[PDB]
Amino acid sequence: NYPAEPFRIKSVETVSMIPRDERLKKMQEAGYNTFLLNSKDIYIDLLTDSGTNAMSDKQWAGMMMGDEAYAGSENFYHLERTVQELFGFKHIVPTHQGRGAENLLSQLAIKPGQYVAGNMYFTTTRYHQEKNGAVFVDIVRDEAHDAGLNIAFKGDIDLKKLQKLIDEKGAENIAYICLAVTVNLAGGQPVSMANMRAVRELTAAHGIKVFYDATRCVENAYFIKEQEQGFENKSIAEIVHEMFSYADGCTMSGKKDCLVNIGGFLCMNDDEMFSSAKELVVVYEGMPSYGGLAGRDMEAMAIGLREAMQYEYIEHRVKQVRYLGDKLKAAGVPIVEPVGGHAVFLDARRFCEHLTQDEFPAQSLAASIYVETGVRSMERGIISAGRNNVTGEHHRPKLETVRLTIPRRVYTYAHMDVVADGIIKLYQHKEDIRGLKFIYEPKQLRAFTARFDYI
Amino acid sequence: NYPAEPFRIKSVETVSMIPRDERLKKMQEAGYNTFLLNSKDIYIDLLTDSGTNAMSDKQWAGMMMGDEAYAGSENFYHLERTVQELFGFKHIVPTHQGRGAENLLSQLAIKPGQYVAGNMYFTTTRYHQEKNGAVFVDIVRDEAHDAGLNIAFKGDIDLKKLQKLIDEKGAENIAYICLAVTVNLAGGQPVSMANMRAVRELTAAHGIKVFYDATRCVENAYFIKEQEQGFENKSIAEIVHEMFSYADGCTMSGKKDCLVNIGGFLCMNDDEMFSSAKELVVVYEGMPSYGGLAGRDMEAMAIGLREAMQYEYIEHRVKQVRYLGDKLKAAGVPIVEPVGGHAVFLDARRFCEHLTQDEFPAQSLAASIYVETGVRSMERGIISAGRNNVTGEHHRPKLETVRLTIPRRVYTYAHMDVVADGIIKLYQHKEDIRGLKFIYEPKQLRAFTARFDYI
Amino acid sequence: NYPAEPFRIKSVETVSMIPRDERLKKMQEAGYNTFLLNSKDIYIDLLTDSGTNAMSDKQWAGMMMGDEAYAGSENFYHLERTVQELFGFKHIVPTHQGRGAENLLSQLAIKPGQYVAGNMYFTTTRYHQEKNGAVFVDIVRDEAHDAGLNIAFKGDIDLKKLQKLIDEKGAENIAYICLAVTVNLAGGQPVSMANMRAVRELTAAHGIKVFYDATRCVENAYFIKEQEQGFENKSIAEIVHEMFSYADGCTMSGKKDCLVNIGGFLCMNDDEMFSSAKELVVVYEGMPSYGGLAGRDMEAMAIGLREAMQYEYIEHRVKQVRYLGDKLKAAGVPIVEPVGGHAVFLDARRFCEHLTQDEFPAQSLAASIYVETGVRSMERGIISAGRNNVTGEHHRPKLETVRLTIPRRVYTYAHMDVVADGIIKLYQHKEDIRGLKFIYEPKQLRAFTARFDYI
Amino acid sequence: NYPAEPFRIKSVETVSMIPRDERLKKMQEAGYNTFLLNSKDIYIDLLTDSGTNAMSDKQWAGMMMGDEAYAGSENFYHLERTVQELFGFKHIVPTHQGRGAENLLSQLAIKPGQYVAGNMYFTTTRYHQEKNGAVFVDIVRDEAHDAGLNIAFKGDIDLKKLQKLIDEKGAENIAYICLAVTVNLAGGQPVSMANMRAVRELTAAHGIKVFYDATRCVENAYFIKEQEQGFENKSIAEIVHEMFSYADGCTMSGKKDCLVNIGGFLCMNDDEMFSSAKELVVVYEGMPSYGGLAGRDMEAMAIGLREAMQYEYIEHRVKQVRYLGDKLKAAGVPIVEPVGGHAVFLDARRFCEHLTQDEFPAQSLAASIYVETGVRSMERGIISAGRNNVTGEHHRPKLETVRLTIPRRVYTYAHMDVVADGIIKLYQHKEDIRGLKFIYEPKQLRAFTARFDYI
Ligand SMILES: C=C(/N=C/c1c(COP(=O)(O)O)cnc(C)c1O)C(=O)O
Ligand SMILES: C=C(/N=C/c1c(COP(=O)(O)O)cnc(C)c1O)C(=O)O
Ligand SMILES: C=C(/N=C/c1c(COP(=O)(O)O)cnc(C)c1O)C(=O)O
Ligand SMILES: C=C(/N=C/c1c(COP(=O)(O)O)cnc(C)c1O)C(=O)O
Ligand SMILES: [K+]
Ligand SMILES: [K+]
Ligand SMILES: [K+]
Numbered sequence A, B, C, D: 001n002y003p004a005e006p007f008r009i010k011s012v013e014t015v016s017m018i019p020r021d022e023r024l025k026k027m028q029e030a031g032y033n034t035f036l037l038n039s040k041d042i043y044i045d046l047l048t049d050s051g052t053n054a055m056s057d058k059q060w061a062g063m064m065m066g067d068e069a070y071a072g073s074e075n076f077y078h079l080e081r082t083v084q085e086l087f088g089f090k091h092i093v094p095t096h097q098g099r100g101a102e103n104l105l106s107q108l109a110i111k112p113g114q115y116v117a118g119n120m121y122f123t124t125t126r127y128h129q130e131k132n133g134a135v136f137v138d139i140v141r142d143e144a145h146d147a148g149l150n151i152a153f154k155g156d157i158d159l160k161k162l163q164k165l166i167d168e169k170g171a172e173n174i175a176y177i178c179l180a181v182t183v184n185l186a187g188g189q190p191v192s193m194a195n196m197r198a199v200r201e202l203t204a205a206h207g208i209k210v211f212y213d214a215t216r217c218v219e220n221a222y223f224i225k226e227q228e229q230g231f232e233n234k235s236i237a238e239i240v241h242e243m244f245s246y247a248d249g250c251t252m253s254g255k256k257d258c259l260v261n262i263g264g265f266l267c268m269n270d271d272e273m274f275s276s277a278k279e280l281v282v283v284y285e286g287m288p289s290y291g292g293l294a295g296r297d298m299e300a301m302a303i304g305l306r307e308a309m310q311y312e313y314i315e316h317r318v319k320q321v322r323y324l325g326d327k328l329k330a331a332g333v334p335i336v337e338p339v340g341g342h343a344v345f346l347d348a349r350r351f352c353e354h355l356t357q358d359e360f361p362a363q364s365l366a367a368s369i370y371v372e373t374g375v376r377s378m379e380r381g382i383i384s385a386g387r388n389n390v391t392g393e394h395h396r397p398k399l400e401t402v403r404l405t406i407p408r409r410v411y412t413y414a415h416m417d418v419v420a421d422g423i424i425k426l427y428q429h430k431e432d433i434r435g436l437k438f439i440y441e442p443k444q445l446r447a448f449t450a451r452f453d454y455i
């Protein structure tokens, strides 16, 4: 049902298990914002799966073989051919992480005033699109915004919404389609191969380019192998390669599915766009031959991307997350369904039904979770959504969630039991969670540095 | 009941998950002898807890700080202060592993014709004693020889047998008392502090020296804290320090409870014996300042010994083994009781009651365990007992067992579930396990290179 | 005269020692462009001192202690305290490398239309200034533009030019003064403490902010200790701390004087500007607590910055470069004088006086240097100067040089002898060096991908 | 003339350069015995080339790939095939270092009362021979004991002395011939291929086995390629393979020419002796599949042995030692000639002509060298020779030397200049070196723990 880890523990990381009362002052010191907690004070850190993964002995062997040359590093050539082989794109430009590649793509493929449409958004991805003069349009299926609706491939793009955008705005006013795999904001929800194929057929007929946000593409490929009909016999690698055959390029954060702690890259097939990308990367990231990464990190990322193609690795990765979700569901704890590839999202609206969204139930549930359990989680609700620029009012998302994000190969099922058991106990007296309000709020990107206080 | 790992995974070790049919071919290639399997073909390797432990990030940081000098290495001084602080002995001599220290002690403290008495024996320990002209005398309590008897501190020395040996032979004819903690041969059974204090009081009255075999002393200290009355307020470190206060010295295999992959040492308080030890260590191991160890390994062992004192680490270590034993016992699988600190012993005589001991049931059970699960275990029965050279007959031990030995910090509860589930499944059709016979048998130490075939 | 290395070799890097005939074929495969050579084909790689340094055993111990948390990593706090202690600034924001910090500073401290003045410029630094709407003004002393003039502290700012800029434009139209230490473009020339104090006094009277480009600040501090009167009793650390006391902030490329292969940061004292920096860093680099760096790399940079303060390290570093310059000068090889802190610049115009600048003498000298020695050097002449886009004409710099850039702690004096001996041998038959012409030329940044053939 | 290092520095080791007065008290604390100095107090540690080598990036990559299994480790298989390929022996048994293999060989191949003859001796090698009942006979050419005689292949066995031993004692009373390459005690002097071939032809005619002490066999192979006629076109590997084709086995210390910090092995071709060796290794070292070594160390040793076959590596290694010898010779400093492969031996008899051998000039010169220069060297004279057991009097060797032993890939020519310059200055007032006498002397192996005082 739930497989054992398809690896052994090679080395362990020291942790501290501090008491509740000490956790209280830290939570107070952090303004009740888990983003402001210190790593050393956290038993199980589920803030994000980005850059928090455990590497393998093979990757660490590569770390000893860093060719740190400014140009022509063997590690770059290794990373280049690995991505060309596994993703199938013609050209690769390394970047220090995913948002470095997003900065490049948005400056290369967007004219001021054009539209960029995709299946929901991510913060840095949407920022670089809008800062380069684009207007974002969400074309995900309406079901993806419904936390409790348990349907497969919730991250699919609504082809009808896409056709509507092309007819009303014109294909020439659409910069590109930004297709994310998986869809982080909807709970790590996958996109079917049929949806990727249908988007490619519709966009190619209008000459509209398609670029993937591929940070969690391997988790996406597992869902296709598990649940999409006709792919149960295909390997993860074959599925990944076919996924990108429907794209003109991609932005990749190795910090997710490449099983590394730093790194990303930009891929594309177009020769002219690749030329302009190499001109722009030297300004922000570095040389086209290292792009803001040490040689050893290009090596670790090349090895890690190949490791992620092992079926047993990715099956266990996803099913460990599912185990935490299943234990929570069995105790009646409200969660986003179905469980995504990288995290379980607690539905703070149902968890904190005594609070309104103006009282920030997700931010307060995350604070309560750490104090009561020593687990750090991330607010993914009204605080992260920001304020509408025209009216200065809160954006009001249907998804008011607390994200329990699982780094790859770091924790065990017993750690998941600690998390689930603590949340299930907290759910018993959920009425005790107090509301929050801003005591400090920045002008932009308030989720990371804002401070709150109770009631 | 069973605690989560008090650490997270820093790095993982690649394994191959070959299916049953391939595991069968590997087992046939190995002549149905788990000792002849290749490490690369094994999912979960429970052959031994010696030298197989996962190190911490701190230990690996120390590995980068190796002072490789031939004399006066900083790593040796670090190791020296740590052992003097934690064990309380005056003098420390490093050795490449435990049997290196036993070679030194046996040559220093034994006159040809003297007696060495202890709570059972280990193979290498008793060999160095007998090769230097000593006759071994078992003075363990009679209960230790009852595999099914579930009683505490089974490893205690019978004080009456000790008093009997002193009266019959004289104190001048007794080289030393060899007190092992824990007792490996009885299943990893602990020794109480009260027994250690009584042995020290009786030997000191007759001027008899006492030297500990302390390879699993930390596991022993946990049993004292858990089960001996009056020690529930003492730290692991306090218990360890008090244990060795009743000894004149010790031999240690760091490859066990020091959480390293290589290393050991010899301790003593006597100045003159320490002087002779420094002369003898240069012949067999190396300088008194490295003793057959790289500098980085003295550092890793010094750091690891201090890590082993953390209560949460050793509690989880012992309870992970107990978890495997409890799950097997709950399904009716016959095991040695009580479960020891480092391993679970399957009673292969009861498990394969349809086979005679001449058909090697423990060897054949270990073979089936690997084929059905990818778990390697060790035969501890008639094969390891060897053949009598004078008569050419099997030595026939009362204990016909398969040893599931758990390396420290390498596996999870899910891995223990893989082991237990496979063994329980085999137990439900145990009548199908076929006997084995020699197709190749060496003249000595047949457990390591013999090959078999089914009957 | 020239000190031995104040360290020993802990580990070595494998190189290939291919003979001249193979090096020729590699050079032809690279189109006679050293930027297109593969690292694996190079014996001594003097392309740059950026990111190519050898780390210490202590830094590598830190690499094993990476706290990879997304927020609140212990490595960030270690880096934070180190910079606050050594540089004296209030606030620190990590970036993946120096140009990442320049991107942040240029967006924070520049209004469109303002002026930025400094002691010459660097490519990435001036680009971020000009892309945010600033006009660059060179206020370096006129002597800095005289390649052959051997005078001290060639990088000082001409206070009269600064006073002239303030009077003509007004202090409100000056974004900040950008003082680089050292000055890379002039050959790595230092700035005196007296010049730093005078700039601070003049700018503070007009309310003009001063930000340092401190990538090679430690090399600069050594020159002050060696050659500025009244500092021979001050430690390197004391000099560094006093240098930054005359600045409101800095951008740093740890890839230079922090003895690492990746990393940088942004410093400032203003609280409000630090708040805006934390909002902007999440868009381009990452969280204020890691800023596009792995935790292990923040640790390595924190350790490396403290190591750079050791007098013996930086003395040997600078004198190793000086050794190469002295040996070349003693044989009559024309070089830029005085020798800078990090590189020796060959005067290719004088070296290949039989060739015109349209025949690319610096590019061709670099080619011959690799073929004859296996040493890679960088063209810093007409090719790197680029082509004017409006007229399609070569930009023609007065400096037509080949840069021998020395990574820190990577090479020995014997390696410098290989470099010098080969160049001196080439100089004895310099008339044989043939000119080059484009067989391929990209539209921009031609230095990195252009290919040539002999004339 | 003297080649540059055929590698780059990947990582550096921190050193301390403490003043003379502090060095004095340490030398006093150590009883004027350099063996008792602390590593942390030494700038350049030339005590020994054993276990002090710098590893490569490839070796350190292997260190991350330790397969720590007790049996069937991939690292053992790597080491096994590498030795079989490069040395040509049938069977390999790993040991923790060379003297572990010597303990095994001496117990396997010696009957009490037999003779073991060889080209001089080493301490641990001769101890295991004599402790197993053999009488040592030196059959090296008489010239090898003359420090100043500069002849090639000084380590050759005198075939006439060998024939004399066979005629007087009988071939049945000769256990084996112990042929060392190189000969450490004579100054690291090589053995010609012709001498190895002649010894094999003479011993095989009498059925006498030949076993090599091969710790520095690669240095030996370089001398053959450099100076023996007909081998200047053969690779180092071909020479090494042919060397061992004249032996029945070997004892190897990886700590020398395998470029590692720990490790050794025993090789042989005989099946029956290999069987007995595997029985004996489990008692002293460990399993035949790891033999007292961590898996990662078997991996590093396998890689290092292959690296030592690179001509440029071993040429530079030997010529760096020769450079130190040439600088000393040019200043008139008396040394053993010719310079050996691994060390320069100062001739303390000529250096301290005002002292008799009873005043221990070599021990006192080593003390003076450290105090005046911060360089540690080893006494190789009357102190190491020991006392004659029959008369209780000093053994009086013709060679009274101070050994400046060079670890592989650790130091530069500039470090050699520091050593040479300091010794040359000390030679100017050599009359100031005071004699020493025992204030403490052990019964055996006095060189390592004895303490002395002046006059
Ligand atoms: C850091 C996170 N996300 C990163 C991310 C990024 C940016 O990648 P970097 O963090 O590697 O810049 C882009 N696209 C998606 C969908 C992402 O989820 C997170 O989910 O916590
Ligand atoms: C190898 C094992 N035991 C080794 C051992 C040793 C030998 O230690 P080394 O393996 O470190 O020599 C000494 N004393 C006891 C009680 C031991 O159990 C084992 O149980 O598999
Ligand atoms: C890459 C080089 N310089 C980079 C540099 C940079 C850019 O730093 P990063 O390369 O760390 O972005 C900034 N400031 C100065 C003065 C620099 O010299 C070089 O000289 O090869
Ligand atoms: C340690 C040294 N010698 C080791 C050695 C050995 C012993 O090797 P281990 O140090 O690896 O035991 C054997 N044979 C020779 C010729 C040796 O030189 C030394 O020369 O300092
Ligand atoms: K990270
Ligand atoms: K680099
Ligand atoms: K060593």
Ligand SMILES: [K+]
Binding pocket: B050, B051, B052, B261, B262, D068, D069, D070, D293, D294, D295
């Ligand atoms: K091991």
